[PDB]
Design a protein around this nucleic acid. Structure first.
Ligand code: K
Ligand code: K
Ligand code: K
Ligand code: K
Ligand code: K
Ligand code: K
Ligand code: K
Ligand code: K
Ligand code: K
Ligand code: K
Ligand code: K
Ligand code: K
Ligand code: K
Ligand code: K
Ligand code: K
Ligand code: K
Ligand code: K
Ligand code: K
Ligand code: K
Ligand code: K
Ligand code: K
Ligand code: K
Ligand code: K
Ligand code: K
Ligand code: K
Ligand code: K
Ligand code: K
Ligand code: K
Ligand code: MG
Ligand code: MG
Ligand code: MG
Ligand code: MG
Ligand code: MG
Ligand code: MG
Ligand code: MG
Ligand code: MG
Ligand code: MG
Ligand code: MG
Ligand code: MG
Ligand code: MG
Ligand code: MG
Ligand code: MG
Ligand code: MG
Ligand code: MG
Ligand code: MG
Ligand code: MG
Ligand code: MG
Ligand code: MG
Ligand code: MG
Ligand code: MG
Ligand code: MG
Ligand code: MG
Ligand code: MG
Ligand code: MG
Ligand code: MG
Ligand code: MG
Ligand code: MG
Ligand code: MG
Ligand code: MG
Ligand code: MG
Ligand code: MG
Ligand code: MG
Ligand code: MG
Ligand code: MG
Ligand code: MG
Ligand code: MG
Ligand code: MG
Ligand code: MG
Ligand code: MG
Ligand code: MG
Ligand code: MG
Ligand code: MG
Ligand code: MG
Ligand code: MG
Ligand code: MG
Ligand code: MG
Ligand code: MG
Ligand code: MG
Ligand code: MG
Ligand code: MG
Ligand code: MG
Ligand code: MG
Ligand code: MG
Ligand code: MG
Ligand code: MG
Ligand code: MG
Ligand code: MG
Ligand code: MG
Ligand code: MG
Ligand code: MG
Ligand code: MG
Ligand code: MG
Ligand code: MG
Ligand code: MG
Ligand code: MG
Ligand code: MG
Ligand code: MG
Ligand code: MG
Ligand code: MG
Ligand code: MG
Ligand code: MG
Ligand code: MG
Ligand code: MG
Ligand code: MG
Ligand code: MG
Ligand code: MG
Ligand code: MG
Ligand code: MG
Ligand code: MG
Ligand code: MG
Ligand code: MG
Ligand code: MG
Ligand code: MG
Ligand code: MG
Ligand code: MG
Ligand code: MG
Ligand code: MG
Ligand code: MG
Ligand code: MG
Ligand code: MG
Ligand code: MG
Ligand code: MG
Ligand code: MG
Ligand code: MG
Lengths: 127, 200, 253
RNA sequence: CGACUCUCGGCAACGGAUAUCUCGGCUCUCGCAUCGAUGAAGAACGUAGCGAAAUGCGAUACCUGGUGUGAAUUGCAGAAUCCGUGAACCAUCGAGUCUUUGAACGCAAGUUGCGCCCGAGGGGCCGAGGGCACGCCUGCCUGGGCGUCACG
RNA sequence: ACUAUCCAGCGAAACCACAGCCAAGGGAACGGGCUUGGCGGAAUCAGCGGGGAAAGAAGACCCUGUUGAGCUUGACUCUAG
RNA sequence: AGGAGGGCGCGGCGGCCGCUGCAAAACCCGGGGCGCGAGCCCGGGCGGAGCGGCCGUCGGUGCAGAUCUUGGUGGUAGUAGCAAAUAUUCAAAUGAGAACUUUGAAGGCCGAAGAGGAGAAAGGUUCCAUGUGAACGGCACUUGCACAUGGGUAAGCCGAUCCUAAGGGACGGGGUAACCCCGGCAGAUAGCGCACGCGCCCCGAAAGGGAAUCGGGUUAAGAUUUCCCGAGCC
RNA sequence: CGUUCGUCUGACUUGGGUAUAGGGGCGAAAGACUAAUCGAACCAUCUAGUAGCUGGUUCCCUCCGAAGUUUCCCUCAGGA
RNA sequence: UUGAAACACGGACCAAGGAGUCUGACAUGCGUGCGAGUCGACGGGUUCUGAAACCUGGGAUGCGCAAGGAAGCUGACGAGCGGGAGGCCCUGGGCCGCACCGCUGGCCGACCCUGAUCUUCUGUGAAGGGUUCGAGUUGGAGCACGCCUGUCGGGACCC
RNA sequence: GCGACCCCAGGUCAGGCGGGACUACCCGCUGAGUUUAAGCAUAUAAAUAAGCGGAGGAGAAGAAACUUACAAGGAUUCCCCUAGUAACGGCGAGCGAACCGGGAGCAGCCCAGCUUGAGAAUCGGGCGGCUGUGCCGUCCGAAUUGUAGUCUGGAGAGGCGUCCUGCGACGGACCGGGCCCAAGUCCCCUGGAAAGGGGCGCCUGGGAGGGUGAGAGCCCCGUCCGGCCCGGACCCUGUCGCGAGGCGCCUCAACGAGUCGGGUUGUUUGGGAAUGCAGCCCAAAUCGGGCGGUAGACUCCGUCCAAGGCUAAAUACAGGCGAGAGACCGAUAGCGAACAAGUACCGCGAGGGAAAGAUGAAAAGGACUUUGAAAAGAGAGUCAAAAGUGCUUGAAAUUGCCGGGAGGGAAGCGGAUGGGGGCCGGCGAUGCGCCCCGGCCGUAUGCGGAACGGCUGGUCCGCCGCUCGG
């Protein structure tokens, strides 16, 4: 049970905050679980999805399929994975959007801030 | 109006609905008042939270003649008889009321006694590390000085009930208490006529 | 505990609208006089008009809170406390107490020191009071109706009510995440917990300190025998409610 | 046997009730105290590669700058950026810019109308830029009157 | 001569308890419906002004209401000047 | 008329007992029943995500009417009607389609105080070109004052602007609780020429007064004096 | 709207500008006109004005069940 | 409406919405607690789910527990009788008799009468009263809350 | 003529201040009527609406020219009570406070007057300096028609004697911001999708809420308990380092004027021979002045000291900025506005003022063939589904078609049958006692548990060993 006076339990307020969220907040909202091997190696549970991350789909009709993130459509709350597509009625190809809460990250793209973020999250999850 | 009712008197002929005062903020008022009392208590840590010392007075008017309560402050004559300069009294937690006067001795003495009891309980901190001042306390007295809550010097309302056992003498009887009340009332209402005849 | 609700004081009166009178073959309801828009000429200022005013608009000075005599409240708590000790009335309220050793169910003061939810579950299993908590854990579901859309989305049954006495115990923390299980202190027992829904027979687990304090609080038939000033335990109108033992007595028969 | 009218059922229409929802409303409680001649509120006109409105902004014009975060924005297209002084229709704010107006202030006003002064910079000419309302206060400068005097 | 009439195209409104042939009776004292009789046979077109006490308007005449308003005066009570 | 009792139904809240993607709510049915009745229970269908019953308690809680409100829909009815301003016809072209568009020919009307040619108010792009889904142009259209995309208004001389008219505002002053109402009530009148000399506010007219332009040419659309050529003027 | 008709160098017709605003204006006078509004315009508010008067007033069954008469009332279609 | 099928008004149809409510003051009734008391309503304390809840302030806050009188001011010195449910005794009679009804009184106060005695000389009150008057007493029953109904102020059933 | 001053004038002189906006709360003025009185004029509506101004985070009020009658209390404000009371009122309708008492919160101060004359000791500005919301220096000015200091009735001055009197360093507390902070996406089934059902597990001081393809504690954000870091606020406070006032005693003692107060007139009040306020007339005092709720005179008594100024807190808050919640509404509801809503549109103008939410998990938004001038159709494709861009569901009125039935100037309706149709099978039975086949044990025992009555007796189960009826 929540105790903070400053935190709202109102369903109307929580839905408004979720859907009217800026781009920088959708990044945290659009986080993905790490795979078992990666969670063991980094001692972190979940990470925000990024472009060029390697991902596996674990829910839906594309469950089991793998690829790399080609697009993070934050406006639509979906990510696009390489070669996860569908043919239209005219025969063209369209990328299918998947919610990042239904995938697991298998390989991470690390520049310099991914490592720093991994260090911050590990310490809490390690102590 | 149709039956055996009271004559109605409803004072609702004006725009009374623009002047309705509800009390939905009553529990919030209680919390705001409680919070300020805790903030005020921390602002004065060793000083008592109940405010300065108050005297004892009789409530006025014949209905409340016999009840005692807290006054506004001590008279300038009471402070002088206890040895407390009137400029020092507010600074050490005593209220001063220059309007009030002392007409009877017993009211005055009980207030002077109250100040003496307060002075034996008061612990004064020096305004610096050096205790060059005279009214300051020893380091031991300051070392254990907490904050008291509530009324550290209560006021007794009304004379305590006490049924005594006495021997009824022969003068206690045949006193004619009703006759005394009537003759004294007559002496009051005959005073003006008696004084008129005396002058003539 | 209710919060007041009301409609606006303006609420259907912020139009300018006058009646057309008779002589035009329309009803005498007030009408919007504008012109040039669909609102012109429509009914206004009436409980029967679209966009009108409610018949008796709800005002904020309704009587929301109700006064109960302090003495009557203490009688109700004492009557709801005694109903918690007869096991038949507890079963009638739906509590599962088939494996409870003794219904007054006094537990040792060691439970006052537990601080984990897993420890609390272990305590309930020892006293046979976990099937009641399981039933409350189940049956948790969405509330049907409009209260769903309001901020009351889940409902459930009531489980055991745990009563402690120490006033500083961490047993409150160990039990507060179990659904349907409430924790109360003996010095501030609530009738809303003792008789949920106005139905007497709550399943109560007493720690030993709480049970021993139960005579200091609520006292007895002696006048100064308790903390509550100006209160005596209520007296039954019938000294022996055993109807069979009175009808089939020797003097009656 | 048929047409017409009425009626019963099935399917199709017309219409938008009912049901389930809801980034809205209403009510209550709490905290805080911050508009303007240093030009406010309000009004106008502009401003995007593709925009009319709403939203934003002001010729630095859906933005410049700082800080934070850390790889997007996306309806289409092109550019920029990635182990980085570094993407973003991101957050936040200390640095900036801020057209015509409006208490509105050179005079006006159904007028982008009618004046005066200074002036970088290139005698005179052309200047970029800027001033010139009213009431009042303290001080100051230039004055008026035998109003009250003094000495010549 | 233009309409009306007939055609192609386009295309309203007023009004509507349900309806729509009569005689007499009784009845809120002038019935489409009720009672007793006369009767009474699909579906359609052009007109017509007897009826529908036809429509149009909560009678404007009349009265009532402890409803007004305009005007007058020797009404009552005031008032600028 | 009226009173009262006992029940039926709607929506919440506190409790209890349940249902549902093996299909909830709502809706439909010449389906089957229960109850005097308000109502209820089941079946079949549709639909695709929630709902019910019992105890207590609470309420914006039950419709046929109010010339009731809002919305939708009938008959009337393919009916009333589309009749002022004299009038059309032929051939061709275009086009899916021509009584209505375009060309030619013919017959007529307005008759120059016009149905002609240009302006002031008012409108604001209706102006010109190209194109055409629907709607609209009360029949129709290939067609447009519709719609879509573009283009188009050039001044020292034409006007405004300058002046004053009836009149309006307004400094000081006067009144006024303030908003505001008063301009002749005279107040050191706020300055003008060459130290010297003098000294009796603004707004208000594209029909009043008034610096100065003519001819010819040019565009899809301008210029009845703005662009070009030439010739002048202030 | 058609035909007919009144006046037509004057107390003539008319454009623009300007003045007068609601118990006020303006009136060769009809209570005329003052934006389709005039024996007191229009707009918003007071205001959900008042009404002894007209209309309406929403589920079932069961039981009981009237009065239009007395008195008083600016009382006579109303109240007690 | 005395009287409607009416040549008396409203109603073309359908869906959704649509009218005795909320608050204050009294009153009777009923239900709950306590009871010569009752009310904890404004405040304070506390409250780890809480605008709940729980505790606490009354030796005088409000209604009650005492009237009458304009007021000054005085203020209940303790009942019988008839009928009575029920209980008891004897074998129809007797005893005790609640509530309620009826009758006659006593006491308090307003008004009027009355006056031994004490007394601060104007007060007191042994006795003795009254075709007078009271929302009195000789029964302590009330206080708080809840609900329906009724009257009244409010938009006040709706237009 | 040179001068000093007074009053005044002009400056785009140097530096400064003001005007407008906002409405919930607050301060000042001005001011109705509808309405009620069952008519209506006083009264009520109401010292309200409208109208004109002024502020703030609160405002205003505030330290007795106050109450009372007591054993007396002791600034303001707000709450409860006083109290629907005293009073007022065609004494009608109605109206209507205060004192005491109990709470919340408490706090008292600054001037003018006589008071430098051995020295205007005071203040502002220009300029310069610095240690900079200020300090110092210098020069000008203001001011004697009075700046500073002392003093304010509680006093005080004067006289005589004893006790009291800045800087920094490091934290706390207050406000804001950031970062981190538990546990399954294991197996089977159904479904387009598991977040549903079944099986096996884990977290919990976290089972508030939200998202994600269906009811998700463990998929994600969060929630709990905490920890870490950054930034404000310059008061408040906790440890460190470095003459004047009070008190006792004793002759002066100054205190606010066209103001008080009185008359009258108007208005207002519960204020009644007059509650406050205002205009006008009269017009003060210092052994005096103002009150003690009935006008007057006289004698006592109680009580205050106006006509100058400031002052936190408790209190108010339909506005603004920012939070939280609800037995509230659910698209004809709730604000007029869930949406480019004070919008479209209407009026010369002041003003008036709507309607309008929902495909699907994902546009996967319907390629292509054929007919047609096109719009479209017919096939086809996507989807779990055409749910086919006003697309969730999709009632009634009303309409078309197909099938059935009836009909001589209405039809519908109640009762009763019949003809035809549509339904239904808990619409309606097939078992029960006697006999040859399949297949279980008493009585007694050892043992284990657990009963009823108030020490005897009871049932069950598993095991034996005799037994035979089921
Ligand atoms: K309040
Ligand atoms: K049909
Ligand atoms: K709905
Ligand atoms: K001009
Ligand atoms: K035709
Ligand atoms: K007849
Ligand atoms: K009139
Ligand atoms: K219910
Ligand atoms: K020009
Ligand atoms: K001109
Ligand atoms: K003539
Ligand atoms: K003529
Ligand atoms: K003219
Ligand atoms: K008028
Ligand atoms: K009447
Ligand atoms: K009718
Ligand atoms: K009554
Ligand atoms: K009491
Ligand atoms: K009397
Ligand atoms: K009512
Ligand atoms: K200086
Ligand atoms: K969830
Ligand atoms: K003085
Ligand atoms: K007066
Ligand atoms: K005096
Ligand atoms: K609306
Ligand atoms: K569908
Ligand atoms: K048919
Ligand atoms: Mg009123
Ligand atoms: Mg009609
Ligand atoms: Mg509404
Ligand atoms: Mg439901
Ligand atoms: Mg934008
Ligand atoms: Mg201007
Ligand atoms: Mg006939
Ligand atoms: Mg008829
Ligand atoms: Mg017949
Ligand atoms: Mg026929
Ligand atoms: Mg015909
Ligand atoms: Mg006819
Ligand atoms: Mg005819
Ligand atoms: Mg009529
Ligand atoms: Mg009429
Ligand atoms: Mg009337
Ligand atoms: Mg009458
Ligand atoms: Mg009149
Ligand atoms: Mg008249
Ligand atoms: Mg049917
Ligand atoms: Mg239901
Ligand atoms: Mg409701
Ligand atoms: Mg209703
Ligand atoms: Mg209806
Ligand atoms: Mg009805
Ligand atoms: Mg109608
Ligand atoms: Mg309608
Ligand atoms: Mg029609
Ligand atoms: Mg025709
Ligand atoms: Mg015609
Ligand atoms: Mg033609
Ligand atoms: Mg001709
Ligand atoms: Mg001709
Ligand atoms: Mg032309
Ligand atoms: Mg054209
Ligand atoms: Mg057409
Ligand atoms: Mg166009
Ligand atoms: Mg010209
Ligand atoms: Mg001029
Ligand atoms: Mg002029
Ligand atoms: Mg002026
Ligand atoms: Mg001009
Ligand atoms: Mg001209
Ligand atoms: Mg042209
Ligand atoms: Mg004519
Ligand atoms: Mg006039
Ligand atoms: Mg004329
Ligand atoms: Mg006339
Ligand atoms: Mg109006
Ligand atoms: Mg009379
Ligand atoms: Mg009638
Ligand atoms: Mg009649
Ligand atoms: Mg009838
Ligand atoms: Mg008739
Ligand atoms: Mg009628
Ligand atoms: Mg009709
Ligand atoms: Mg309805
Ligand atoms: Mg007597
Ligand atoms: Mg007497
Ligand atoms: Mg009404
Ligand atoms: Mg200057
Ligand atoms: Mg201002
Ligand atoms: Mg009246
Ligand atoms: Mg009336
Ligand atoms: Mg009248
Ligand atoms: Mg106002
Ligand atoms: Mg401010
Ligand atoms: Mg103040
Ligand atoms: Mg004083
Ligand atoms: Mg006081
Ligand atoms: Mg009372
Ligand atoms: Mg009043
Ligand atoms: Mg008061
Ligand atoms: Mg008090
Ligand atoms: Mg000066
Ligand atoms: Mg001085
Ligand atoms: Mg001194
Ligand atoms: Mg001295
Ligand atoms: Mg986590
Ligand atoms: Mg499971
Ligand atoms: Mg679904
Ligand atoms: Mg006076
Ligand atoms: Mg007067
Ligand atoms: Mg006044
Ligand atoms: Mg007196
Ligand atoms: Mg004074
Ligand atoms: Mg003062
Ligand atoms: Mg003040
Ligand atoms: Mg406060
Ligand atoms: Mg606010
Ligand atoms: Mg709406
Ligand atoms: Mg609805
Ligand atoms: Mg118009
Ligand atoms: Mg769905
Ligand atoms: Mg649909
Ligand atoms: Mg239908």
């Amino acid at each position: 049970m929540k105790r903070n006076p400053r935190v709202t339990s109102s369903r109307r307020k929580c839905r408004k905050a979720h859907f009217t969220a800026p781009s920088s907040v959708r990044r945290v909202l659009m986080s993905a679980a790490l795979s078992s091997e990666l969670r063991h190696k980094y001692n972190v549970r979940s990470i925000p999805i990024r472009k060029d991350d390697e991902v596996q789909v674990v829910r839906g009709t594309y469950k089991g399929r793998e690829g790399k993130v080609v697009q993070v459509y934050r406006r639509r709350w979906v990510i696009h994975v390489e070669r996860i597509t569908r043919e239209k009625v005219n025969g063209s190809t369209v990328n299918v959007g998947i919610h990042p809460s239904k995938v697991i990250v298998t390989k991470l793209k690390l520049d310099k801030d991914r490592k720093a973020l991994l260090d911050r999250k590990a310490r809490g999850r390690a102590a | 109006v149709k039956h055996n009712n009271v004559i109605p008197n409803g004072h609702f002929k004006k725009h009374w609905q623009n002047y309705v005062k509800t009390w939905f903020n009553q529990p919030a008022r209680k919390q705001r008042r409680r919070i300020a009392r805790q903030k005020n208590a921390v602002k004065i840590f060793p000083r008592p939270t109940s405010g300065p010392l108050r005297p004892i007075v009789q409530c006025q008017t014949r209905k409340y003649n016999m009840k005692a309560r807290a006054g506004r402050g001590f008279t300038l004559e009471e402070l002088k008889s206890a040895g407390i300069p009137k400029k020092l009294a507010p600074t050490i937690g005593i209220s001063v009321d220059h309007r009030r006067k002392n007409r009877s001795l017993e009211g005055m003495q009980s207030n002077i006694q109250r100040l003496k009891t307060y002075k034996a309980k008061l612990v004064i901190f020096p305004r610096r590390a050096r205790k060059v001042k005279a009214g300051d306390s020893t380091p031991e007295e300051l070392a254990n000085a907490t904050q008291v809550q509530g009324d550290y010097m209560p006021i007794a309302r009304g004379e305590k009930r006490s049924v005594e056992v006495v021997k009824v003498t022969e003068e206690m009887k045949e006193f004619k208490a009703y006759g005394k009340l009537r003759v004294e009332r007559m002496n009051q209402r005959q005073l003006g006529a008696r004084q008129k005849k005396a002058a003539e | 505990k209710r919060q007041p609700y009301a409609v606006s004081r303006r609420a259907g009166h912020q139009t300018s609208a006058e009646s057309w009178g008779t002589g035009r073959a329309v009803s005498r309801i007030p009408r919007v006089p504008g012109g040039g828009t669909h609102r012109a000429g429509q009914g206004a200022f009436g409980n029967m008009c679209r966009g009108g005013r409610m018949f008796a608009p709800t005002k904020t000075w309704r009587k929301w809170h109700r006064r109960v005599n302090v003495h009557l409240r203490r009688v109700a708590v004492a009557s709801a406390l005694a109903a918690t000790s007869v096991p038949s009335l507890v079963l009638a309220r739906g509590h599962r107490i088939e494996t409870v050793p003794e219904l007054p169910l006094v537990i040792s003061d060691s439970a006052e020191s537990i601080e984990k939810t897993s420890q609390a579950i272990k305590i309930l299993k020892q006293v046979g009071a976990y099937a009641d908590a399981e039933k409350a854990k189940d049956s948790v579901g969405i509330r049907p109706g409009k209260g769903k859309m309001r901020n009351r989305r889940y409902i459930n049954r009531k489980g055991p009510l745990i009563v402690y006495g120490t006033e500083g115990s961490k047993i409150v923390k160990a039990f507060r995440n179990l659904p349907g299980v409430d924790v109360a202190n003996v010095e501030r027992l609530n009738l809303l917990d003792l008789a949920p829904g106005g139905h007497l027979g709550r399943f109560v687990i007493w720690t030993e300190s709480a049970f021993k304090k139960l005579e200091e609080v609520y006292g007895t038939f002696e006048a100064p025998s308790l903390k509550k000033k100006g209160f005596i335990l209520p007296r039954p109108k019938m000294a022996n409610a055993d109807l069979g033992r009175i009808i089939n007595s020797d003097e009656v028969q």
